Design a protein around this ligand. Structure first.
Ligand SMILES: NC(=O)c1ccc[n+]([C@@H]2O[C@H](COP(=O)([O-])OP(=O)(O)OC[C@H]3O[C@@H](n4cnc5c(N)ncnc54)[C@H](O)[C@@H]3O)[C@@H](O)[C@H]2O)c1
Ligand SMILES: NC(=O)c1ccc[n+]([C@@H]2O[C@H](COP(=O)([O-])OP(=O)(O)OC[C@H]3O[C@@H](n4cnc5c(N)ncnc54)[C@H](O)[C@@H]3O)[C@@H](O)[C@H]2O)c1
Lengths: 336, 336
């Protein structure tokens, strides 16, 4: 059961609102679009197809009715342009801001481009939303905001130094959100995502996340590379857990706003465990080498999600094996 | 005696280098230009004349010799354009990055342009500088970074939450700088300036700083606004102490780099005191009412400059009363 969550989605079904999703053509965005359209919401979407894909939009369309898709207004455009930000904001109740350039290695090769989309574009959306006086604003933050802080599990109040240009960008997101609360009274919720996975996560390109990458590699019969001894560990968070936290945040009482929340399960899985999980799941529906640790890699990562549970009534009910079970058939179809 | 500073300027005169000053037409940038040309350095200046002035460059021209002037190459341009940043970096040894749009209330009223000049512009310059392999990189940071930290005096390690968009941008400069050292080995110095004042600080405009605004006012015979009751206090730091810190930073030992330094004198002057010191200094060269409070603005500010004194051998020569005595003759000439 997902019960404050069930009650809210029930309520959305009876009383549609207007939502903005930036990054709507992307992994998390397109999953939010699918859920909102099935709740019969009115969705305004923004994307420049930098890392996102028309084919994601095309997939959502074949999963919703004609009438539900008629409530989707898609604008191809860039959050780095303030005018565009202000146009897509007209009439909007709830902002779900997911548009960013993720990937730590990307940000090291080209910090300029990562800065402009993740800081400039983020500020544009935050400032448009504040001017338009939307009901809520929730943005994608990042567990890389923990930086070099040694605590584990990671608790929201205790962060360290950021370790890459990417991490600076997501941290600045939070500090700006905080300043906007203070200066204009505009209260927002930042969501520190941890290793999100599930359908429509891109398995291609140099920056592919491990789950999609390894899944694609298993299905092609290509080498699955483990960086290190394999005892490195993550709190992998199935996509529905994130959808859940986004909707809970858009509809949070005022006292829950101007807050950061970890979004994860609270569990740790090793790379050695993961590899066996993926393989075991793929091989029910049909069809490895060790190398150097990646440089400047975090050894172990795990969220404390107590704050989300207590203040938003989050239930992290989809754990990693269930998540892989649910994600694997989408990869099988996509790759074949 | 500014002993180390003297020795370091002697090295420069014997073995001149190429310097980039961004913000060279502004208050601090033009004082840096003046000292560097007088040391026979080759100087590249970048400015967009947003808050800066041609008249500052014309004044400097009259103060240096012809040969010294012939070593100044001025480029009108914007740090928001990456290409421009790359071009003016060419053959540069030392970067003194001063270009920004200062002022807390400016940032509250336009956090967007402020974000673009002070974050994007900073990163463009930091990144161009890294790729050009400069010998050093020193940037204007801000005592606004202390935020709501309640401790006095202000110590570098101990900062609080940012209280304005401008505080955010100045802090983001430090965090980027720190990431560049960790990620690229590129070691910078950030100077948290505290209430600088001296010749060529603009007395005109909605954002004038208190010393020149009030000086202007008593020369015109206008009303002098003391916000609050007279007691509020600052660490006013005459411009020559800033020039010294810039030059010491540019030639610091490697272990002194990747560090933030308070740039001030360690003193605390009351508004009641200043209003008085200013009247007393002005009226020595011939020729009042209380009010409100502001927002983003602080009751008490005093720097601990131990760190600069110890690590760079900074010697804060000039205290507020003598700075004023030194500054007022420029203010008469400029207004009369
Ligand atoms: N995936 C994770 O595990 C993870 C971890 C930490 C943070 N995040 C954050 O989650 C959000 C979504 O990530 P994702 O996994 O869905 O990534 P994704 O790359 O699949 O989606 C991001 C979307 O943003 C769009 N976009 C990028 N720049 C844009 C711009 N300037 N204007 C308009 N659209 C732009 C892209 O086209 C893409 O459709 C991002 O903010 C990312 O930083 C994700
Ligand atoms: N005066 C103080 O007490 C104080 C305190 C804290 C920080 N600072 C910092 O000191 C630096 C210098 O300040 P100042 O007092 O000399 O201010 P100033 O306004 O006199 O100088 C700023 C200079 O930067 C130039 N500039 C601004 N944006 C630019 C851009 N986008 N491209 C190119 N040039 C641009 C302006 O034209 C100007 O000549 C700034 O970074 C400011 O944030 C000053």
């Amino acid at each position: 059961y997902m019960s404050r969550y069930e009650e809210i989605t029930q309520q959305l079904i009876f009383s549609p609102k207007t939502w903005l999703i930036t990054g709507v053509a992307g992994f998390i965005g397109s999953n939010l679009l699918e859920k909102l359209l099935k709740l019969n919401q009115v969705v305004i979407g923004l994307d420049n197809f930098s890392t996102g894909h028309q084919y994601n939009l095309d997939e959502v369309k074949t999963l919703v009715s004609t009438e539900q898709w008629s409530r989707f207004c898609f604008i191809e455009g860039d959050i780095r342009d303030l005018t565009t930000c202000e146009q897509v904001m007209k009439g909007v109740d709830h902002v779900l801001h997911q548009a960013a350039l993720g990937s730590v290695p990307r940000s090291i090769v080209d910090p300029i481009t990562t800065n402009a989309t993740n800081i400039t574009g983020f500020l544009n959306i935050l400032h448009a939303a504040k001017n338009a006086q939307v009901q809520s604003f929730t943005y994608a933050a990042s567990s890389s905001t923990y930086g070099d802080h040694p605590a584990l599990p990671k608790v929201e109040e205790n962060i360290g130094n950021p370790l890459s240009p990417y991490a600076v960008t997501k941290y600045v997101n939070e500090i700006y959100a905080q300043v906007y609360a203070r200066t204009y009274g505009f209260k927002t919720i930042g969501l520190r995502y941890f290793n999100v996975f599930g359908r429509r996560q891109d398995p291609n390109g140099a920056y592919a996340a491990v789950i999609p990458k390894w899944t694609a590699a298993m299905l092609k019969g290509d080498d699955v590379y483990i960086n290190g001894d394999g005892e490195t560990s993550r709190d992998f968070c199935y996509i529905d857990n994130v959808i859940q936290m986004n909707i809970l945040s858009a509809l949070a009482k005022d006292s829950a706003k101007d807050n950061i929340y970890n979004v994860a399960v609270g569990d740790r899985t090793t790379l050695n465990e993961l590899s066996g999980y993926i393989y075991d799941e793929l091989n029910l529906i049909h069809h490895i080498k060790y190398r150097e640790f990646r440089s400047g890699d975090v050894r172990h990562s795990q969220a404390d999600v107590t704050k989300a549970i207590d203040l938003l009534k989050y239930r992290p009910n989809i754990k990693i094996r269930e998540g892989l079970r649910l994600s694997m058939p989408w990869y099988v179809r996509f790759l074949k």
